[PDB]
Amino acid sequence: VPDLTGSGEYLVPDVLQPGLTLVLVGTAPSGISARARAYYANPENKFWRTLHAVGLTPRQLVPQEYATLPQYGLGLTDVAKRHSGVAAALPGEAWRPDELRRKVEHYRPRIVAFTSKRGASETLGVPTGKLPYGPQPQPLDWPAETELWVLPSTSPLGHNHFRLEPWQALGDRVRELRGAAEA
């Protein structure tokens, strides 16, 4: 399994460990994210606000706090780890859903939630037009106790098509899992 920095090749470390409730998977770090060595660092990207809004986190983290997410049972990675920029501009070799799948198999998070259709589409091999938001039918193949979700992009270019429902449902689902855990 790769280490969290991909032996120093990754632009920004993975946040991954056994026992996580939810790993949020993007396409690739924006340029701003790569330069900041953080996640969803573009100040107009709604991701950090959204996690707070939906109670995945109790405060709005700043991008540089991204690695603290495991204290809330959350982790982070991307389909493309060695390149930055917008999906359309990435070289084809940027996308490594194979490395993602190896990580998921290793760490066994309860949920993998793609933070855009494009990331889910690069991984699942289904065109974005075919993917609903929310939980996906349990696919192929994948730890059965690892549910798969597709979420509306929080990127500024999507303010647009952005919808809170899938993110709040996810928030509720994480609450429900972490609460069953305790009971």
Side-chain angles (χ1 to χ4, degrees), residues 60-84:
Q60 172 174 333
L61 308 216
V62 296
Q64 283 173 93
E65 283 172 337
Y66 72 97
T68 68
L69 284 179
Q71 77 178 320
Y72 304 129
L74 267 55
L76 294 169
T77 184
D78 287 320
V79 184
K81 287 298 304 195
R82 298 186 177 76
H83 300 80
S84 69

Side-chain angles (χ1 to χ4, degrees), residues 22-128:
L22 163 61
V23 170
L24 289 144
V25 181
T27 43
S30 72
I32 289 168
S33 293
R35 293 195 309 278
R37 286 183 199 169
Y39 283 77
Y40 305 102
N42 176 324
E44 298 186 297
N45 190 297
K46 305 188 246 292
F47 182 84
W48 296 110
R49 179 173 344 145
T50 301
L51 296 198
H52 184 204
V54 309
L56 284 166
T57 71
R59 263 169 1 91
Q60 172 174 333
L61 308 216
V62 296
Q64 283 173 93
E65 283 172 337
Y66 72 97
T68 68
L69 284 179
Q71 77 178 320
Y72 304 129
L74 267 55
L76 294 169
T77 184
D78 287 320
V79 184
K81 287 298 304 195
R82 298 186 177 76
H83 300 80
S84 69
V86 312
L90 287 180
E93 60 269 30
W95 307 100
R96 304 294 306 277
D98 59 309
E99 291 186 323
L100 172 55
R101 276 174 185 278
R102 292 163 54 236
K103 293 165 194 176
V104 173
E105 171 52 39
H106 177 79
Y107 293 111
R108 299 300 184 80
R110 293 312 314 280
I111 303 160
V112 172
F114 295 86
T115 62
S116 63
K117 296 210 185 180
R118 184 59 184 269
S121 164
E122 290 295 340
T123 302
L124 300 170
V126 298
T128 57

